[PDB]
Design an enzyme around this catalytic site. Sequence first.
Site, PDB file in Angstrom:
ATOM      1  N   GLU B  56       0.850  -1.218   0.000  1.00  0.00           N
ATOM      2  CA  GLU B  56       0.000   0.000   0.000  1.00  0.00           C
ATOM      3  C   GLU B  56       0.869   1.245   0.000  1.00  0.00           C
ATOM      4  O   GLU B  56       1.881   1.319   0.734  1.00  0.00           O
ATOM      5  CB  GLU B  56      -0.975   0.073   1.201  1.00  0.00           C
ATOM      6  CG  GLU B  56      -2.066  -1.055   1.188  1.00  0.00           C
ATOM      7  CD  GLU B  56      -3.080  -0.998   2.303  1.00  0.00           C
ATOM      8  OE1 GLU B  56      -2.689  -1.148   3.468  1.00  0.00           O
ATOM      9  OE2 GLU B  56      -4.297  -0.868   2.007  1.00  0.00           O
ATOM     10  N   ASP B 200     -10.357   7.705 -23.019  1.00  0.00           N
ATOM     11  CA  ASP B 200     -10.312   6.250 -22.706  1.00  0.00           C
ATOM     12  C   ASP B 200      -9.875   5.490 -23.987  1.00  0.00           C
ATOM     13  O   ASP B 200     -10.686   5.241 -24.903  1.00  0.00           O
ATOM     14  CB  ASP B 200     -11.689   5.743 -22.204  1.00  0.00           C
ATOM     15  CG  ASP B 200     -11.684   4.278 -21.762  1.00  0.00           C
ATOM     16  OD1 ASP B 200     -10.688   3.542 -22.000  1.00  0.00           O
ATOM     17  OD2 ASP B 200     -12.763   3.884 -21.208  1.00  0.00           O
ATOM     18  N   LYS B 229      -6.277  -6.101 -24.415  1.00  0.00           N
ATOM     19  CA  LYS B 229      -6.811  -5.555 -25.679  1.00  0.00           C
ATOM     20  C   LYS B 229      -5.613  -5.328 -26.667  1.00  0.00           C
ATOM     21  O   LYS B 229      -4.671  -6.164 -26.657  1.00  0.00           O
ATOM     22  CB  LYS B 229      -7.836  -4.397 -25.516  1.00  0.00           C
ATOM     23  CG  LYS B 229      -9.013  -4.752 -24.554  1.00  0.00           C
ATOM     24  CD  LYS B 229     -10.190  -3.695 -24.495  1.00  0.00           C
ATOM     25  CE  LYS B 229     -11.169  -4.000 -23.347  1.00  0.00           C
ATOM     26  NZ  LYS B 229     -12.500  -3.298 -23.330  1.00  0.00           N
ATOM     27  N   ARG B 235      -4.289  -8.968 -17.895  1.00  0.00           N
ATOM     28  CA  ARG B 235      -5.613  -8.348 -17.594  1.00  0.00           C
ATOM     29  C   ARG B 235      -5.508  -7.372 -16.388  1.00  0.00           C
ATOM     30  O   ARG B 235      -5.290  -7.809 -15.215  1.00  0.00           O
ATOM     31  CB  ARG B 235      -6.648  -9.475 -17.404  1.00  0.00           C
ATOM     32  CG  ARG B 235      -8.099  -8.985 -17.295  1.00  0.00           C
ATOM     33  CD  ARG B 235      -9.091 -10.190 -17.385  1.00  0.00           C
ATOM     34  NE  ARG B 235      -9.053 -10.828 -18.724  1.00  0.00           N
ATOM     35  CZ  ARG B 235      -9.683 -10.410 -19.810  1.00  0.00           C
ATOM     36  NH1 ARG B 235     -10.483  -9.335 -19.754  1.00  0.00           N
ATOM     37  NH2 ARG B 235      -9.491 -11.030 -20.977  1.00  0.00           N
TER      38      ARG B 235
END
Lengths: 414, 428
Positions: B56, B200, B229, B235
């Site tokens: 974190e 985007d 993509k 992913r």
Amino acid sequence: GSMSAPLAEVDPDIAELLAKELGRQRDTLEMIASENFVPRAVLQAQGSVLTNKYAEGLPGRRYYGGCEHVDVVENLARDRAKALFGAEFANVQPHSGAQANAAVLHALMSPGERLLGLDLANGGHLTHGMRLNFSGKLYENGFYGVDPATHLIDMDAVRATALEFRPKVIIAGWSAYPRVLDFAAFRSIADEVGAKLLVDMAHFAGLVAAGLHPSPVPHADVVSTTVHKTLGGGRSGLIVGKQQYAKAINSAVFPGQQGGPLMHVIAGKAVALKIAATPEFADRQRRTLSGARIIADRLMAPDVAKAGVSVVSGGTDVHLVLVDLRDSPLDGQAAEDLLHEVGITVNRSGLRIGTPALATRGFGDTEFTEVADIIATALATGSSVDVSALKDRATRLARAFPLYDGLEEWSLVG
Amino acid sequence: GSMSAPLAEVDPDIAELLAKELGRQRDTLEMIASENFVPRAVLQAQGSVLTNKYAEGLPGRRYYGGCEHVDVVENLARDRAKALFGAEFANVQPHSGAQANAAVLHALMSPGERLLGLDLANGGHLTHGMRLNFSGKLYENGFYGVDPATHLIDMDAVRATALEFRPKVIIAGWSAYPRVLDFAAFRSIADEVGAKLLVDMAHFAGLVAAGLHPSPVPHADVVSTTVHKTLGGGRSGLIVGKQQYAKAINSAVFPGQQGGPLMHVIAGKAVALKIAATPEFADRQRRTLSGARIIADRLMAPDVAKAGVSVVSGGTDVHLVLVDLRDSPLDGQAAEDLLHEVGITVNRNAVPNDPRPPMVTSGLRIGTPALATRGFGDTEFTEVADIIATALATGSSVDVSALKDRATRLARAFPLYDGLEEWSLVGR
Ligand SMILES: [Mg+2]
């Protein structure tokens, strides 16, 4: 071409860094209460070609074709989670513990409504109401705490606050608390004021799975968790609960919060849930709890008490020990740095010390006795502390319990 | 102990399903435009012991000890993203494309404020304002579309809508559009009405990396993307943009939206960004674009037209083709099912002013990235184009056996993941 080339050929700097991190995990004593070590079979699932499949929707009701095999995978994970925890319903798509909690609050409440949770200063998580997180930005927050004398949650005090504040959702759960929550009392209070009850069991889920901490599932509307931490799996989230919330929760995960799920990671969730039902896993949880009790006892001995150091609540019933340094010569940062010098990783006038990762690596009572004595000597003896002698004792222990022995020869599949 | 036991011993049912899914990927021709195949090196990163580290915070400013090696990994991914795309800052922690967009909106607006995006019916994504997603639940939504005659985005119409609605944030981006966005016009409109501009680029990021689609980075305040993509990685999500917005975007990712980052997946992002700068990758993007133009040209022919089929916008400049089926016997679901019979995976897609319900549609979306990664060039794309055109034009006389045999011939000639069963987790 590069599609079939090994990492060593394609990206030499990343290959070397994977080797350095494996070395660091092997050489140090890891005592961060939120950390663990995944099994070989979870590494294999996370490194699988299931990363290539887009599977938006639910098993049997997907956007796209070709999901026949990944649908059986997701159903094994759902059905194993229901059986292990005794729950009516499961969703296994959340990307993390934080994403599981964002979806539960989306399903059960609207922006501007009232949320009641454990205070950050008293052991709560940032997803239970902190001002910069979604939980603080979207909702009107109230908090409960611990009794200043006993350091335990006082359920008469929680009751009086709920009757005053009238929350829509009450959260039970914690990131740093050393004792067992009363889930039946939380249920009674929620019913009186007409609130839903969420239990966030991220830290203690592996204790629940082995039967060594009471279950929240009979008492809660919805239960959220990480699959990592004490449950011992790959980094991700999970939700289980009562059947009446199945449509609300499914629609909140997708399309409410997320897009495509990580199907390689869901395959690893099914594996971790199978391991969590075994007698071997249950013994590992027992070695976790006995190690934490051995460390707490040693830090309440006359030499440590005289240095001004105290153990919060006078012991522990869980996988961690909470220590108060305010009447000692050390602050939190100074204690953390001194333990790093002798080969031990912890986190911060407070300090938290955890046992899950060392139990997974194979430590039992003799080994936890040695680790507790190293910590106590560092915290008690001030300027006269022999850092070098303490480091050699830590490296001796690490060397004797090899971590991931043989990884350098293991296959992706088979 | 089970800590060192193989998956085939620990969980035979899951091991069996992994082998069946690998076989399905090898035996089919994948033409879903959002799908691709990761390299060996990304499988190895995603299967690494970096899953065990809590991290974190950001490099040099973490909330856990022991992060020295994962801080170098995160800085390689940030520095490679900034150099590849020419951007002032990067955040490499988002868990997905959807999670990248949630953090951007958290940073730039407040609940109840106004958001303008492309409609789902006109090729937008569900995170651009759909009613039951966060983007519709939290914000007041307005939409723009495409022209009913030309099928293109009309920037004079986008300007008129922005002047009336006065949005806080405008989104430029798409999941199904076959032409090049005018980024300089979006900047002018945003500057006129005092809005922030989010691009985007999830679908077209790999075309930008290769220099084969104009870049949004000089024109946008912030840019979101998937690393999967056309970019060809594992992913996950990514954000890049102007330094003006760095402090707000970093705070929005953590503690705004997420907790611990996936450090094993971030190692794989660094690998995919190195591959994306290479000449081999640029050749793969050239083959992706040439293949899509070949499919569009074959569909614009007398046999296909006479069966009641046309191409949306009369062509393509990107990695996909949008097919209009409404004058033929086949609805979108029927055409998707027929192509599955002949060994080819596509998806149904809504057409301009579609007469069918949104879950059925009168169109298809057909993509080329996954087959280009597998090694197809112009010869192979000419053959798959003829298979598709024949299926859609022959009506009740279609020969499924002859067409399926032509597809499986191509799959056997271009093996996928050949030798995977012998590869190691680490080393060679
Ligand atoms: Mg503002």
